[PDB]
Every structure is written in structure tokens, then in C-alpha cells.
């Protein structure tokens, strides 16, 4: 006759049981509700059936799983084990997604800081080109050849960034080879006359015409000038052509590879 | 005579015991149920006996293990230790699977974004070819030679992506070598006449015919043109052939490697 | 006379003590039981005394350790510390085994997906050969030379996979060098006649006979054809031999390395 | 008639319920409050709508989520599971942001220590230039050519740092080649006379004029001097020119590549 | 006069105190016991005073530390902090030992699988030799030169494994160069006669005598044969010698590097 | 009329509330106190406004946050969630700082062990120079050229360390080339006479004068000697000069690159 | 008048308060005690003021921090937050120290196993030399040149280890070039006579004198012999010298680089 005497014990367990069932059913209707709601809000963005609908299904499963674990705890069964396995799974998936998340974070930083603007000619680790646009997970640029390149944001931020366009003026360099016999002063004079004649070069800024080094086959002269970024490339070509003409007119000779032979007959 | 006086203590322990046994048996029938259910739902997809049936067995073991740990906790024995070892195991397996999970996540991102479409000619880190299809864990493409290549999705997203097809028009480049003696202006005139004659080249877009650099053995001329992607390759060959013919007709001579010897007898 | 008055306190502690001893002894008999059971089931697979028997001993130790920790908790001594050290150890061993586990997981994926079948000629990062079989932790293939190679599954999945056999048809390429003096049209005609004569080449598919590039010592011709994978290698050799014969018959001359010397005496 | 008898139980549950609702509503008004406050304080710094407003929204969501979880715990539902999933997410995002955080920490260290000052000529792993400024996440410097380079702080601290400017004086080195026939002592005398004549060289500091090594084609002389950093470059050029002139005046001859032929006729 | 009225409170705290002291002393005697026991069992294996005795001391310290922490918890002082620091330390040491543990695990796998047997000629990433024995943490092999090499097990499993011995038969390859003038058919006939004469070659298996490629200086012939692994090396040498003799007898001439000069006087 | 009957319940909640408010206010005054104290102690070391004052502000925020979380727990709201997010943040920041902490730890080890002393000539992975000083996070050394280099402590400890200065005596090596025609014994005799004449060489220690190898163009002789570290460099130069003189006196001839031509006219 | 009625509540809180203060003060005296004790025991080993005294200070701070946290818990304030931040810090520092700990563990393994003894000539990844001693964190060896090298233990264990000394006997190899015209048999006979004459070579062990390969400029002969490790180097030199003499006596001629020219005049 312990039953009549333990009515209170029965009350305690019965309220817990009905509360657990109530939790199950309320969580079920809550899950239905949340599932329809998430779709209602998800349709706004572009939506792919094979993936986007799938992820809403994932959410449904996650909610019912949480409510179920909670219910099992309500019943009075230790859920620490299921919590542990769940946490291991979550950690693993987070590790897997770390890579993509890094690209996302980089992209955000690059967007707010703006190291390079759109439409600028830059290089991002050996790939010169003009940027077209920036995106969340990736960057898009066009090469000189015309090929399109896509590069992940996370990869570029780590590497060095070079922005030719940001600087208005840039410097040029020429190297020239001539024979040993030829006079130094004559060549220097000619080169000075040439560079002086040009107009797209900045007089105020430095100009260098000296003998940098002595090659084995021939001596080498170095020339340095400064010009606007836009006209740089044209300047190079024009100067080079003028040099070729002027040297042949002057009498200087360009050097071929040089060989000296000691020559005996056996 | 403590027994009669501690009837309530006995009640407390007895209810816990029978509840633990009930948990064991209900978990057993639940595990049988879940095992048959998972197979019922698993048969839909392609199923390999050596692996797929094995994983259902794994699920059976996992469920019975969870229920068993819970039962041990119900008995009143500290289960924190078994929880700890279980969590270590789960973490380890998650780390092991991280690699494959990364490929999966990448594939998802690539699918939704579509950096490159199927049937496009692209390169994905030094392997040019045409894509055939995209998959969950991997990508499939065909090389020009005809070899098939498979590349994991996770590997390509990290690296740069190049999409030749995405751009309609592309640029070409030629390099040419000629002797120093030969006149600059004559060569330039000839090359201009050639490129002008062609019809598959875009007049509106830039055209470059200049002396880029001075080689040691010979001077070098650079030529740049723009044409449609489809006809690019043909254009290259036709232009090259026409150049060879035109130069020999003109009298210009192509250069062989050049050597100059100072020559003494011992 | 607190003892008589605190009989209940004594009861509480005494039941805990005897329950702890009971747990110890039941865990001992359980451990004996489990140890014999694991051997009974382990004998089925191949079993090495120096390792396999050792791991059963490990299991014995693990079970007795768990039961002992639980008993210490039953006595009323904080076991959180022993749990912590145990968890650190488990994490460390899991990290150590991560590498091998990765190979295992890869192997599973490769088995179910079947990127390459057994008996196919494939390359798996610079090692061409024919696969012999697939295994759990590793893959086995034979090289052309006849050497056997073993490669871990985890390593290959990361790298690119190339399956020559999967594709029925493949393409070939030849490169040829000839003197500048020689006529273009004559050579082209001869090469076309040759390739046309062959029967193992696919007429429907493309055929290319053009001047690809101008070498310094000599010009270069490129030839491309398509043929079945099986007969490809033979086709290459036969074509090459026929070419050698046909050129000497025609009067064309193959080029040696070319040198031009300006020659003065001192 | 358990209700009348369990008034106290009802009181207990009712106070918990109303307290949970109170927590929900107070947390709601708190969240509104915090959201407006964070904007009020955020406007001070530069603010981008697409990102900065977004992060305030994130904060709103985070606060309401915390309060909601707390409320669920107040109701009496186990929240350990939701805590676990939340912690996994937090760990993952922290891992993702680790990279950028590293750059930030580096930048801080570099700022306080000041290995290199602004406006100094330094190299930071193969990129010589002058620093312009230091920033939080990145560093900015200008190359000699005039190109701008941006380099992340985290990358440079790991690598070696070279500060030319920090040292007032620096050393120079010349290498010279001459024929075997030429006398050693004469050359040494000439070189000593040259270096002695210069004035921008530090007499007190060492000066080296010796035969370092015997090349195959010719012998090699090494020269070392010390000069101020500013005038170093000029000194090099002037010395080199003077050397060329002095040698031709002296009668020494510079060497061309040397070849010796044993010469037989077949 | 609260003392007389709170006798029970005093009892509660006093029993806890004496139990804590009892735990301390029992743990002390337990630690002495365990320390002597571990030595008793440790002497069996080889034992180094500077390290092995040290590790027994470590065990003593660990046990007393655990018992001490437990005692502090018994007193009623929160030990969660000491647990936390202890767990951090354990995690760190586990990370440090991960490397060695990996080698151990690899060694186990290699032992049970036996990719390569002892006394076999194998290469394990560019180090050819004969294995001598396998060990727990490392592998031992001898090179052809006679040098001894030790390689850690963990390093080799990651890399490719090549087992020459496992395969009974292997293939050989020869490359040969001859002048352009020389007849193709004559050379082919001679080579066929040679290989046919040999007896250590497998007739049933393939034999290849064809013109593989056209070198610039000379044409190249390829020869392939199959022979037993043991006699392979000898076969190579004998064949090569016979070839040299046969060619000079036949009248064919081996080629020297070939140069062609266009030769003008200035 | 439950209020009058539940006075005790009201007491319980009221004491908790006032205690929570007391905790808030005491923590506030404690935070003010700690903030002023930390500055008082921080001024001793060099202090940067933009960073050092900022970190004191950080401490203020941290303390108020801890006290606030504690207060929320006092109120009776589950704080496990806020604890979880806080722990994730702490883990992330610790990971970020791991890099710098590694440099710090290395520096400590290097300081106490002293592998290389200050003012010694050492190389630390391809950067030879003299150390100037050691610091906490980095090391400073000067190169021979005079450039200053800074290298992080963590990077050098991993790599090999070479200490020229630690060893008093060092060895030298010379290589010499001579013509085939020249007698072996004569050359050996001459070289022995030379090295014997020198005084800065250690007679007791080994001396080697032998023919090491046969070059294609010429034979090579190797010479090895031992001398004090300080005088090593001078010894090299003096020996080399003496050798040049002695050979020309003896009649031996140094070799130029050697070519042999078979020479036919077409 | 709740105070008089709640005397017991007051007792409960008052005992907790005084116990907390007692814990604070006992922990303070305990910390003083431990601080002096640790110094007393620390003086035995070499002790640096800037670091070693600092670490004792660290210990003082750690103990007072633990006792303080415990006290805060005794007061009744949730300390889980402070525990969490502390654990994050500990994890971070452990990660930082992981590197050095790895070197320590390696060193231990190497010490007990003894792969290489002290005073042996070994190479440890491209650095040949003689070991001098082994240490805890690092290894010390001397190079042949006389330079001292220090290498961390953790780095070497990962890489291959080569122990020349462990093996008593070693093998040698010579390569020789001769003209095509020269007879094979004569050369073989001469070489056999030479090697047979020597006495420091092991007759029982193999001896190889064969034509290994056909070079373009000349044919190549390979010779292999076995000798004791100590006398190996001397044997090489003596054999080489004898070979040079014997060939010139025999009439064989060593080959120079060979060139063949087809020679036409334009």
C-alpha cells in the first residue's frame, strides 16, 4: 500500500513526464514554424534547389535534435555523452570551414581598407593586371594578355601587394653594351644629348649616365630616368630606337659575344 | 531491524534499479528499431556491402554505447571518465576527416558561385583543359592531349583560377629576331603591311610594332594584336608563315647565333 | 555517546563503502570476462603475438582503470584531476594517430568512388604504372620498368589523379627541325602525304601540319594526330621512321647546331 | 484536490515563469538600448554602411541570443547542448581570425620596439626601398624604381630585417680580371695609387688590394674600401671609371673569354 | 552558547577534517608503496640512472600531487583553478610528444603489414639499400656504398615505398646514338642479332629495337629487354661491351658533338 | 495573503538582490582602484600613449566584465553561455600571440645557455657576421659589409648555429689546376717547399699535398693546412700569391679551357 | 525583528566569511613560505639574476592568484569566468613552449637509444663532422674544416641519420674516361694489374672493373673496391696517382672535350 502513501512521489514523476511530452510537442510545432519561416526569409537571395533547400532541411534536423536532447535530459537520462559527441562533430566541421572563413575575413578587411582600388593596375604575387571588381570570397582581375584570373582573398592578403597606379611617377632603366676600344667620353656625351632631347622626361628629377660594371665580353652602361606612368612604356621604345640610330651614326659598334683562342696544331 | 525502518531507502534504490533495467531494455529495442530503419532509408542510394552495411553496424554500436553509458550513470557510477575518453576519440576522428570535409565545403562554394562553367577551357594551377563536370568531392576535366585529370575541389579553390573562355577577345604576341645590319624602317614597314592585310585582327584595338630590346646575337622586334578567342590559334600560324615568306622576299636575313673570335697562333 | 545517536550517519557511510568494494570486485570479474571475450573474438583475424596480444592487455588495463577511478569517486575523493590527466593523454594519442586515420578515411573514399579502377594505367603524382589492387591503408601499383611501388592512400587523394585508360582515344605530337633554306611548301606536302598514308589515325578528328615556331638554329614544324590508346605508341615509332626515310629521299636535310663566326687575325 | 494542497508548488513554478518572461522583456529593452548606444559611439570613426552597420546588427543578434539561452535555462530546459554548439562556432571563427590577429600583434610589437624608423632605407625579405609609414595591419614602403609595395606586418617580423640606414658607414667591394701574362706587382701598385688618390674613402679603416682567386680564363683581384653610406654609390662609379682609364694607360689588357684548341684534320 | 546547540555542525566539519588528514596520510603511504613497486617492475628492462630513475621520481610527484589536490577539495576549497592549470600543462606536454608518438604508431603499422621484409633491397625516398632490421621508433638499412642509415618510421610511411626485391623480374633500357649518315636497317639488324645471342634475356617477354627520337647532334636508338633481377646488372654491362665491339666491327661510327659553322672573314 | 506567509522567501530573494548590487558597486570601486594602481606601477618602464595607456584601459574593461558576469550569476541567470563565448575569444587571442611568445621563449633559452657569446663571429642560417647584443624578442648582429641585420630569436634556434670564434684553430683548403703534360712529382715538390717555408702554419697538425681528382680540361691538386683563426685569411692570400710566382718561375703552366676539334671541309 | 529569528542564517554567513579571510591569510603565509623554500632549493643549479630570480617571483604570483580565486569562490561569487580566462592563457603558453619541449623530448630519446655515440664521424642532414657531446636541448659537433656547429635535437631526429663510423668497412668508387680508339681489353688489363698490386684492398670482397656507360665525348670505366674505413681516403689518392702514371706509360691518352665541325665557307 506504498502507492497511496507515495502519491506525492507519483505527482513528481508524472509532472516531469507530461512536461517532457509537452516539450517534445511544442518543439515539434516550433520546428515546423521555424522551417517555414526560414524559407520565407531565404527566398529573397538567389536560391539553388540542390543546396539552398538542403540547408533549410539541415536547420529542421538541428532544431529537432536540440529539442530531443533536452527532452531526454528532462526524462532523467544523462545526456552528457550525446553532448560530447555533438561537440566533437561541431568542432570538426568548424575546422573544415576555417579555410573558407579565412577568405571571407580577409575580403572584409581588404574592402574596408582598400589597399588597391578597382580599375587599377596592380600585381598580387606575380600576376600583373587590372582589377575589375572585388567580391566576398574572391577577387577578379584581368591580365594584359586578356586572360581572366580569379584569386582568393585570403591568399593575396598574406602576400605582398604592389600598386603601380597609386604612384603618379615612376622610374625607368636602360642597360647598354659597347666595345672596350670605344671611348668612354664620346658615348657618355651622345647618351646625354639623347636623353636631353626628349621632352617626356622630368629634368628636375635625377638623371644617371654612368659606367655601372665591366662585363667580360663588353662594358655596360646604365641609364636611369623618371617619367609619368602613362607615357613610360612609349618613352622606353622611342629612346631605344633613337639610341640604335645614333650609335651607328656616331661610329660606335655594338658587341657580339667575344672569344679569344690560343691556337696550336698537333 | 533497520530494514523495516528504512523501507523508504529501499524504495528509492529499487526504483532506480528497475528504471535502469528498463532503460537498458527500451534502449535495446530502440536500437533494433533504429538499425532496421536506417537500412530501410539507406537502400535508396548506391550501396556497397563492404562499407555501407558496415556503417549501419557502426550506428547500432554507437546507440547501444550511448544507452549503456546513460544506464551506468543511472546506477550511480561516475561516468565522467568514459565521457572523457569518448570525447577524445571523437575529436581525433573529426581531425582525421577534416581533410575530406574541406574538399566537400569547397565543392559547395564552387557550385553555388560558379567561377567556371562546365564545358569551358580553363587552367587550375598548370593543367589546361576543358571541364566536363563538377562533383561533390572532386572535379573532372579533359586535357588537350586527351588525358583525363581528376583534381580535388579543396585544392583548386586555394590556387588561382584562370578562365580563358569567359573573356571573348584575347591578345597575341610575336617575337622576331633580325640582323643588326638590316634597316629598322624597312622591317617595320613590312610588318605593318602584313598585319594590316589580315582580316581576323581588330583594327579598333591597339596594334604594336616596335623594337622592344637589343639582343646580343641580334635585335628583337615585338608584335601585338587582338583577335577573337576562337580564331586566335589559327591567326598565329598564318601570320608566322606569311612573315617567313615576306622576309626572304624582302632580302632581310634571319640571324644565326653569332660569335666573334680574336685569333692568334702560338 | 554520539555513535548511538548517529547510527544513521554510520549507515550512510557504510553502504557507500560496501558499494565501493562491490564495484571494485564486480569490475574485476567484469574485466576478466571482457579480457577472455575479446580474445575469443580476436582470434578470427590474423594475429601477431608481439602486438595483437599486447593490445588485449591494453584493454584489460583500460577497463580496470575506469572502474578504479569510478570507485575512487564512490569513496568520496575528487577525481576531476585524474580525469583531466587522462583526457590530456587521450588527446595526445589521438593527435598521434591522426595521420594514419587520414590514410584510412581517404582509402574509404577512393574505394566507394572508384576514381581509378584496378588494372588501369594511371599516374598518381609522377609515378606512371598499372594498378594491381587497392587496400585499406595503402595502394599498390606496378611501374613500366617492373618495379613495385606502394603509396599511401592519404597522399594520392590530395594530389592530382591522371587516368590514361579511362579515355579511349588520345592525341600525339611530333616536333621536327629543318634548315631555313628548305622550302616550306615541299615539306608540308611531304608530311601530309605521310600522315595520310597511315591507317591507324583518325581522319574525322583534327590533323595539324604547320610551322609552330622559328628556332635560332633551325625552324620547327609541329604535327598532331589522334589515335586509339592501345596503338598510340606503335604509331609514333612507325611515323618517325617513315619521316626519316622520306626526308632523305626528298632531298631535305636535317639541321646540326648552327654557328656563325666573324673571324679576324691579330 | 491536490491543487489546494500544492499551492506552494504552484507558487514555485509561477514565480519562475514570470521571472523568465521578465528576463525576456528586460533583455529585449536592454538589447534595443545597447544597439542604439553602440551606434552612438561607433559614428566617431570612419563607417561603411555595407560592413559597419552590419556589425552593429550582429551585436543585436548576439545579445538577444544570450538572453534567450539564459531564459530557456530559467524555464528549466537543459541548455548545455546549445552552449556546446555555440562554443564550437566561436572556436571556429576565432581560428579563422587568427591570421589577421597575428598581423595586428606583430604591428604592435614593431611599433613599440621600432626596429626600423620611418623614412629609412631598408629591405624586408628581398624588397629594398624606403619606408613611408607604419600602420596597424600592414606596412607601406616605396621601391627605388618608384613602385609602391604593401607588406603585412606579420610576414616581415618572421623574416630577417636589414637596416642600411642605421649604420653610418658601409663597405664596398670591387672584383677585377686581368691576363695571366700581366705582372702582379705593377697592377697592385696601380690600384693602390688609384684608391689612395680618392678622398671619400676612410684611410683609418682597412684597405685591401690582393689576389683573391685564380679564374680559369683569367686571374681575379679583389678590392675593399669603406666610405660613408650617402657617397658610397658615387664612389663605386668614379673608381670604376678611373680604373678603366688607368689600365689602358698602363698597358694592362682586360681579358676576353679564353679558349685553347688542339687542332687536327681528318 | 551556540556551541552546545551546534554540536552537529561541529561533528560535520570535524569528520571532514579528519577524513582529509586521513586521505593525506593514506595517499602518502600509497605513494611510497607505488614508488617502490614501480622500481621493482622497472628493473627488468634496460635502465639508465640519469633518465629511468628520474621518471620514477616523476611518478612519485604526480601521485602526491593528485592526492593533494583531492585533499584540498575535501577541505572545501575550490580546486577548479588548479585543475585548469594542470590540464593546460598536460595538453602542452601531449602536443610536444605528438611527434615521437607518430613515429611509434607508424612503426606499429609497418610491423603488422610488412610492406617490405627484412633483408630486401628497397628505396625509401631516394636512399637505396638493403634493410637490416625494423625497430619501434626507427628503421635501419645499409646502403650499397656501405654507409649505415637510420630513418624514422613516421617519415617513411608518408613517402612512397619502392620494393625492387618483391618483383622477381625487371626490365632494362639502353639508349644509343649514331650518325645520321648511317643506315637505319643495318643498325637495327645488328642490335637484333646481339640481343638474340644473349641467353639471360626472356624471349617470351617483349623486346624493343626502334628509333625513339631524333637528337640534334645525332639520332637515338632505344632498346628494352626483360631479365631476372639478380642477373640484371651483369646483363647491362655485357650487352654494352658487345655493342661497342660490334659497331666498330660493322663500320658504324659513334657521334661526337656536332657543330656547323658559317665562316666569313672581316 | 501568501506574502505574509512567505516572508522567508522574500528574505531569501532580497538578500541575494542587495548582495548582487553590493558586488556591482564594490567591483566598480575595485576597478577604479586597480586602474589607478596599474598606471602607478606602469610608469616605471618606457610608456607609449597610443599603446601603453590603451592596455590599462583594456584591463579596466576586463575587470568590470568579470565582475558583471559574476553579478549576473548572483542574480540567478545562467552565465554558461557568456563564459563559453569569452573562452572562445581567449583561445583565439592566445593562438594569435603564440608566434611572438615562441620568440620570447627561445630568447630566454638562448640567454641562459649562451650558445654564442656577444662579439663573436657566427652565422645563423646563411648570414655571417659579428653579434652585437641579444634582446628579448630579437637578436642583433652586424655583417662584414657593414649592414645591420635583425633576426627573431625563434627563427634562429630552429636552424643550425655555427660559431667560428668558439674554435681557436681552423683549417684551410686550396685547389689548383695544371696541365696534363706537367710532371706530378715536380709540382708536388714545389708545393711542399712553399707550404714548408710559411711560419703561420701548424707543422704538428696534418698537411696534405695530393692529386684529388682528374678534371676534363686539367688535373686538380688539393692542399690543406691548419692555422690560427685570426691569421687564416692573410695566410690564404699570401700562399696564393707565392704559388703564382713559383709556378711561372718553375716552368709549369696554368691551363686554359681545353677544346679538341675534328675538322673536315664540306 | 528578523535578526533574532535568523541567528542561524547569520551564523552560516559569518563562518563562511571568517573562513574566507582565514584562507586568504593562510595562503599568504603559505606563499611566503613556498617562495623562500623554492629559492633555498634553486640555488643549487647555476642561477641567473635576470631570469632565475624572475621565475621564483612568477611562482609567488601564481600561488597567490590560485588562493585568491579560491577565496572568491568561498565568498560566493561565480569564478567560472576567471577560470576560463586563466585556462585560455595556460593553453596559449603551452602552445608557445611546445617547440622547445619537442627538442627536449627528442634529446631524451636520442640519449637513451644512442643512435650515434660521441666521438663518431656522422652526418645529420648535410653537415658532416665528428660529434663532441650531447646535451639536453641541443647537440654539438665539429666539422672537418674545424668550424663548430650546434644543431637542435628535435631537428635531427626527424631527418635521416648517417653513421660512417658504425660500419667497419666501406666501399670506394672511381670513374675514368678514355678515348674511343683505345682498346678495351688493354685498359681492363692495366686496371686489374693496378688494383691487384695494392694491399689495403679486400680481395675476398667484390672487385669490379667494367665499362659502365658510353659518354658522348669519351667512354667511361667504373672501378669499385672495398677497404677499411680508416685507410679509405689514402687508398683513393694513391690509386688515382698510380693510374695517371700507368696510363701515360701504357700509351693510352686521356680525353679532352670533343667537338666535330662541318665547315663551309660563304
The rounded distance, in Å, linking the Cα atoms of G30 and G25 is: 8
The rounded distance, in Å, linking the Cα atoms of A198 and A200 is: 6
Residue-wise burial string across F199-237, b where 16 or more C-beta atoms lie within 10 A, e elsewhere: eebeeeeeeebbbbebeebbbebebbbbbebeebeebbe
Residues 6 or more apart whose Cβ sits within 8 Å of residue A249: none
Tell me the sheet residues that pair with B225: B172
Inter-chain residue contact C261 with E262, CB threshold 8 Å: yes
G neighbour chains, 3+ CB pairs within 8 Å? E, F
Facing residue for B167 by CB, picked from A78, A147, A255: A147
Single out the residue of A63, A69, A65, A62 nearest to residue A20, CA to CA: A69
E98 touches chain C (CB under 8 A): yes
G152 touches chain F (CB under 8 A): yes
* Residue whose C-alpha cell reads 553509458 in the numeric block: B69
The rounded distance, in Å, linking the Cα atoms of C137 and F94 is: 36
* Residue whose C-alpha cell reads 620570447 in the numeric block: F104
Task: Kindly identify which residue of chain B lies nearest to residue C169, measuring between CA atoms.
Answer: B146
- Distance from G90 to chain E by nearest Cα, in Å? 5
Spell out the alpha helix ranges (H) of D78-183: 80-113, 153-158
Task: Kindly identify which residue of chain B lies nearest to residue C215, measuring between CA atoms.
Answer: B256
> Residue E208 is inside which H or E element, if any?
strand E208-214
- Distance from F249 to chain D by nearest Cα, in Å? 13
Q: Is D159 exposed, middle or buried (0-12, 13-18, 19+ CB in 10 A)?
A: middle
Spell out the alpha helix ranges (H) of chain B: 2-5, 7-42, 54-75, 80-113, 153-158, 184-197, 229-250
Inter-chain residue contact F241 with D73, CB threshold 8 Å: no
D263 touches chain A (CB under 8 A): yes
Chain C stretch 222-241, residues whose beta carbon is closer than 8 A to a beta carbon of chain B:
226
Chain A stretch 130-149, residues whose beta carbon is closer than 8 A to a beta carbon of chain D:
none
Residue D24, CA atoms < 13 Å, CB-side half-sphere: 12
Q: Is B145 exposed, middle or buried (0-12, 13-18, 19+ CB in 10 A)?
A: middle
The rounded distance, in Å, linking the Cα atoms of A243 and A5 is: 116
Inter-chain residue contact E144 with G217, CB threshold 8 Å: no
Q: What is the residue range of B41's domain?
A: 3-109
- Measured between beta carbons, which residues in chain C are less than 8 angstroms from residue E164? 147-148
3 state SS for F202-255: CCCCCCEEEEEEECCCCEEEEEEEEEEHHHHHHHHHHHHHHHHHHHHHHCCCCC
The rounded distance, in Å, linking the Cα atoms of D192 and D190 is: 5
* Residue whose C-alpha cell reads 644509343 in the numeric block: E176
Q: Is E161 exposed, middle or buried (0-12, 13-18, 19+ CB in 10 A)?
A: buried
Facing residue for C260 by CB, picked from E65, E214, E262: E262
Residues 6 or more apart whose Cβ sits within 8 Å of residue C198: C235, C238, C239
E strands present in A117-257: 121-123, 128-134, 138-142, 148-152, 161-163, 169-178, 208-214, 219-228
Cell of B117: 562553367
Inter-chain residue contact G115 with E84, CB threshold 8 Å: no
Residues, chain C = 266
Facing residue for D88 by CB, picked from A79, A94, A180: A94
The rounded distance, in Å, linking the Cα atoms of A115 and D140 is: 10
Number of H helices, E strands in chain G: 7, 9
- Distance from F81 to chain G by nearest Cα, in Å? 11
Q: Is F67 exposed, middle or buried (0-12, 13-18, 19+ CB in 10 A)?
A: buried
Cell of A243: 639610341
Number of H helices, E strands in chain C: 7, 9
Using a threshold of 3 CB pairs under 8 A, tell whether chains E and D touch: no
Inter-chain residue contact C144 with E171, CB threshold 8 Å: yes
Single out the residue of G218, G157, G134, G230 nearest to residue G184, CA to CA: G218
- Measured between beta carbons, which residues in chain B are less than 8 angstroms from residue A223? none
Cell of A223: 641609364
Cell of G74: 568561498
Facing residue for B265 by CB, picked from A147, A258, A263: A263
Residue-wise burial string across B240-253, b where 16 or more C-beta atoms lie within 10 A, e elsewhere: beebbeebeeeebe
Task: Kindly identify which residue of chain C lies nearest to residue E228, measuring between CA atoms.
Answer: C146
3 state SS for C250-265: HCCCCCCCEEEEEEEE
The CATH code of the domain that includes E15 is: 1.10.287.1260
C101 touches chain B (CB under 8 A): yes
Inter-chain residue contact D157 with F152, CB threshold 8 Å: yes
- Angstrom CA distances, G220 to A126, A131, E240, E249, G212, stand at 45, 58, 12, 20, 6
C-beta of residue A259 within 8 angstroms of C-beta of residue D259 = yes
Facing residue for F85 by CB, picked from D7, D90, D180: D90
E245 touches chain G (CB under 8 A): yes
The rounded distance, in Å, linking the Cα atoms of E213 and C212 is: 19
Spell out the alpha helix ranges (H) of C114-173: 153-158
Single out the residue of A131, G198, D117 nearest to residue F148, CA to CA: D117
Inter-chain residue contact B115 with A87, CB threshold 8 Å: no
C-beta of residue C160 within 8 angstroms of C-beta of residue C125 = yes
Task: Kindly identify which residue of chain A lies nearest to residue B82, measuring between CA atoms.
Answer: A81
Residue to mutate among C61, C85, C109, with most B CBs inside 10 A, is: C109
Phi, psi torsion values for C166, nearest 5 degrees: -55, -35
D264 touches chain F (CB under 8 A): yes
Handedness of CA D98, D101, D102, D103 (dihedral sign): positive
E206 touches chain C (CB under 8 A): no
Pairing mode, if any, of strands D128-134 and C208-214?
Answer: unpaired
How crowded is residue A83: how many other Cβ atoms within 10 Å of its Cβ? 20
- Measured between beta carbons, which residues in chain A are less than 8 angstroms from residue D10? none
G59 touches chain E (CB under 8 A): no
Inter-chain residue contact A150 with B173, CB threshold 8 Å: no
Facing residue for C88 by CB, picked from E66, E90, E259: E90
First to last CA, chain G: 131
E strands present in chain B: 121-123, 128-134, 138-142, 148-152, 161-163, 169-178, 208-214, 219-228, 258-265
Residue to mutate among D64, D102, D201, with most F CBs inside 10 A, is: D102
C181 touches chain B (CB under 8 A): no
The rounded distance, in Å, linking the Cα atoms of D249 and D245 is: 6
* Residue whose C-alpha cell reads 529537432 in the numeric block: A64
* Residue whose C-alpha cell reads 622630368 in the numeric block: A202
**DSSP-derived 3-state class of residue A53:** helix
Inter-chain residue contact F97 with G99, CB threshold 8 Å: no
Phi, psi torsion values for D73, nearest 5 degrees: -65, -40
- Angstrom CA distances, F118 to A67, D45, E258, F154, F246, stand at 66, 47, 60, 18, 42
Using a threshold of 3 CB pairs under 8 A, tell whether chains D and F touch: yes
D219 touches chain F (CB under 8 A): yes
B neighbour chains, 3+ CB pairs within 8 Å? A, C
> Residue C266 is inside which H or E element, if any?
none
Residues, chain E = 266
F213 touches chain D (CB under 8 A): no
- Distance from F152 to chain D by nearest Cα, in Å? 7
Amino acid at each position: 500500500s506504498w502507492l497511496v502513501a507515495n502519491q506525492a512521489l507519483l505527482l513528481s514523476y508524472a509532472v516531469n513526464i507530461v512536461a517532457a511530452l509537452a516539450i517534445i510537442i511544442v518543439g515539434l510545432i516550433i520546428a515546423r514554424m521555424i522551417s517555414n519561416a526560414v524559407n520565407r526569409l531565404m527566398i529573397s537571395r538567389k536560391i539553388d534547389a540542390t543546396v539552398a533547400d538542403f540547408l533549410s532541411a539541415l536547420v529542421r534536423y538541428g532544431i529537432i535534435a536540440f529539442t530531443l536532447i533536452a527532452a531526454l535530459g528532462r526524462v532523467g537520462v544523462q545526456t552528457a555523452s550525446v553532448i560530447a559527441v555533438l561537440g566533437a562533430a561541431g568542432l570538426a566541421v568548424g575546422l573544415a570551414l576555417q579555410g573558407s572563413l579565412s577568405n571571407l575575413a580577409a575580403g572584409v578587411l581588404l574592402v574596408m581598407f582598400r589597399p588597391f582600388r578597382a580599375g587599377e593596375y596592380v600585381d598580387l604575387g606575380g600576376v600583373a593586371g587590372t582589377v575589375l571588381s572585388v567580391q566576398i570570397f574572391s577577387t577578379t582581375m584581368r591580365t594584359a594578355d586578356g586572360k581572366i584570373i580569379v584569386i582568393p582573398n585570403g591568399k593575396i592578403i598574406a602576400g605582398n601587394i604592389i600598386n603601380f597606379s597609386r604612384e603618379p611617377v615612376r622610374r625607368n632603366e636602360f642597360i647598354i653594351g659597347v666595345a672596350y676600344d670605344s671611348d668612354i667620353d664620346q658615348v657618355k656625351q651622345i647618351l646625354t644629348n639623347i636623353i636631353q632631347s626628349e621632352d617626356r622626361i622630368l629634368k628636375d628629377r635625377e638623371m644617371t649616365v654612368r659606367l655601372n660594371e665591366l662585363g667580360a665580353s663588353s662594358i655596360n652602361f646604365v641609364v636611369r630616368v623618371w617619367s609619368n606612368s602613362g607615357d613610360l612604356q612609349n618613352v622606353y621604345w622611342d629612346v631605344l630606337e633613337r639610341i640604335k640610330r645614333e650609335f651607328d651614326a656616331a661610329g660606335i659598334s655594338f658587341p657580339y659575344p667575344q672569344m679569344d683562342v690560343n691556337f696550336k696544331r698537333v
